[PDB]
Amino acid sequence: GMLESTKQFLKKYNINDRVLKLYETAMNDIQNQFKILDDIREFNQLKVLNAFQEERISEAHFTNSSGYGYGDIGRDSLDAVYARVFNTESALVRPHFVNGTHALGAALFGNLRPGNTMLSVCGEPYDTLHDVIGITENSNMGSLKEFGINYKQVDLKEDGKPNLEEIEKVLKEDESITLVHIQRSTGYGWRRALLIEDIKSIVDCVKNIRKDIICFVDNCYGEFMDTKEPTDVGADLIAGSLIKNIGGGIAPTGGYLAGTKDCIEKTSYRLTVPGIGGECGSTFGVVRSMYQGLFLAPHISMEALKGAILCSRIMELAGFEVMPKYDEKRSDIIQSIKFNDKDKLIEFCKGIQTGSPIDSFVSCEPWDMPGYTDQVIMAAGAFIQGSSIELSADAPIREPYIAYLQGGLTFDHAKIGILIALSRIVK
């Protein structure tokens, strides 16, 4: 149990006895969930190891390609390793994707053509994808809508599960629909992420209407949450970011897609241009970090999830509503806390900032950010800028004052920040 020396050290952070008791109770309560996670982690570590070994990765794959990067074996074998991990025909892993949204956008523009319609089946996509699609606003930035590609949407049911009957009806009534988009993570929605079994039910439902419909999954935040990925239950294409789970906290930028050879090649032509695709693109010497990040990903992903589960339990014990609960099956690393008080939300986030190794001294306050209307507060202090796998928090400043917390390179770090933050509002 916690050392007396550690207790004294935490007192210098103003962590009080009431918070320590809540922590001891929460740790005791969540032990069985941690064991479930360790069983999954064990399988995923083996899965990833096997993929490296099947590709015969060697020292020589730590390339330092320049120029066109023709024949960069490090890049080509990393794609192969990912495709093995995800059990897909192909993959496309590049530092050139600037963020996860870029990878998703490349998938969409890559696989859609004028006259086609895409169908999002988990309600409204996260905000940044809205400009990519041209859902509401269009200002000639060149959205899907501006290239004659249409958008439709089926919301999740009241219970948070996909509306399979409506999905079928919408597909049957519109034969122009060639792509179904499934967001795995909840985003800022007060509901559960979709479980792998839910993604399967969706794909089976879609494929039963027209087998040729491409089932695309935004896999961000869901890597290594289960022993299966969406590609193990019928997904034709998935996309994600290398500064979230799959980079293991160390890939410095980039993104990935895994799926059928056709979907990947089509995506590659949007990443670069038709006729080039993924054949060109040197990797700036960062390929070693991308291999290593993948190898560490199953473990680091669970450190962060463990942080989320402790957060869920401890905040519940402190009297705050939380989503998800500590014992629910999770499909992402995000934890939401309803403070129901603006000041508590602000102080909690400030606490998280002070618990960061980087920029721990920085002003953490509400600010107006481009196109949000409501102010936003963000705690971030990472080794890799914008990394979601490193402890961070964000919240719109509006009723009922919900904060979203994610990451933690280690469970001990996430725990420490959580204790600092909670001590700012519970004493």
Ligand X SMILES: Cc1ncc(COP(=O)(O)O)c(C=O)c1O
Annotated binding site for pyridoxal 5'-phosphate: 68, 100-101, 126
Return the range that interacts with a second copy (CB under 8 A); candidates 17-25, 54-62, 181-189, 332-340.
Answer: 54-62
Interface positions, 193-222, toward ligand X (CB under 6 A)? 218, 220-221
What percent helix, strand, coil does the chain show, rounded to 5? 45, 15, 45
Return the range that interacts with ligand X (CB under 6 A); candidates 44-52, 134-142, 179-187, 318-326.
Answer: 179-187
Closest CB to a second copy among residues 166, 358? 358
Closest CB to a second copy among residues 88, 268? 268
Residue 380 tokens read as: 């971030």
- Asked if 369 and 376 count as a contact pair (C-beta separation under 8 A), the reply is yes
Question: Among ligand X, a second copy, none, what binds residue 319 when CB lies within 5 to 8 Å by partner kind?
Answer: none
- Asked if 110 and 118 count as a contact pair (C-beta separation under 8 A), the reply is no
Per-residue binder mask for a second copy (CB under 8 A), 8-27, x = binder: -xx-x---------------
State the minimum distance, in angstroms, from the CB of residue 53 to ligand X: 26
Residue 386 tokens read as: 């914008």
**Count of C-beta atoms within a 10 Å radius of residue 426:** 18
Question: Among ligand X, a second copy, none, what binds residue 47 when CB lies within 5 to 8 Å by partner kind?
Answer: a second copy
Return the range that interacts with a second copy (CB under 8 A); candidates 93-101, 169-177, 330-338, 393-401.
Answer: 93-101
- Asked if 338 and 321 count as a contact pair (C-beta separation under 8 A), the reply is yes
Return the range that interacts with a second copy (CB under 8 A); candidates 158-166, 199-207, 211-219, 350-358.
Answer: 350-358
Strands (E), 63-220: 90-94, 117-120, 150-153, 177-183, 214-218
* Alpha-carbon gap, residue 353 to 348, rounded angstroms: 9
H/E element holding 394? strand 392-396
Question: Among a second copy, ligand X, none, what binds residue 86 when CB lies within 5 to 8 Å by partner kind?
Answer: none
H/E element holding 218? strand 214-218
State the minimum distance, in angstroms, from the CB of residue 63 to ligand X: 20
Closest CB to ligand X among residues 99, 312? 99
Question: Among a second copy, ligand X, none, what binds residue 185 when CB lies within 5 to 8 Å by partner kind?
Answer: ligand X
Can you tell me which of 77, 99, 117, 335 binds ligand X, judged by CB under 6 A?
A: 99
Return the range that interacts with ligand X (CB under 6 A); candidates 93-101, 298-306, 354-362, 412-420.
Answer: 93-101
Long-range contacts of 124-127 (CB under 8 A, 24+ apart): 124/153, 124/155, 125/181, 125/183, 125/218, 126/183, 126/185, 126/187, 126/188, 126/218, 127/187
- DSSP class of residue 173 equals H
Which residues pair with residue 258 across a beta bridge?
91, 238
- Asked if 278 and 272 count as a contact pair (C-beta separation under 8 A), the reply is yes
With binding defined as CB under 8 A, does residue 250 bind a second copy?
yes
Interface positions, 361-420, toward a second copy (CB under 8 A)? 361-362, 370-371, 382-387, 409-410, 412-413, 415-416
Can you tell me which of 18, 25, 148, 155 binds a second copy, judged by CB under 8 A?
A: 148
The helix/strand/coil state of 314 is helix
Interface positions, 150-189, toward a second copy (CB under 8 A)? none
Handedness of CA 397, 162, 102, 112 (dihedral sign): negative
Question: Among ligand X, a second copy, none, what binds residue 348 when CB lies within 5 to 8 Å by partner kind?
Answer: none
Number of C-alpha atoms within 13 angstroms, CB side, residue 285?
0
- Report the interface residues with ligand X, using CB under 6 A: 99-101, 104, 126, 128, 183, 185, 187, 218, 220-221, 241
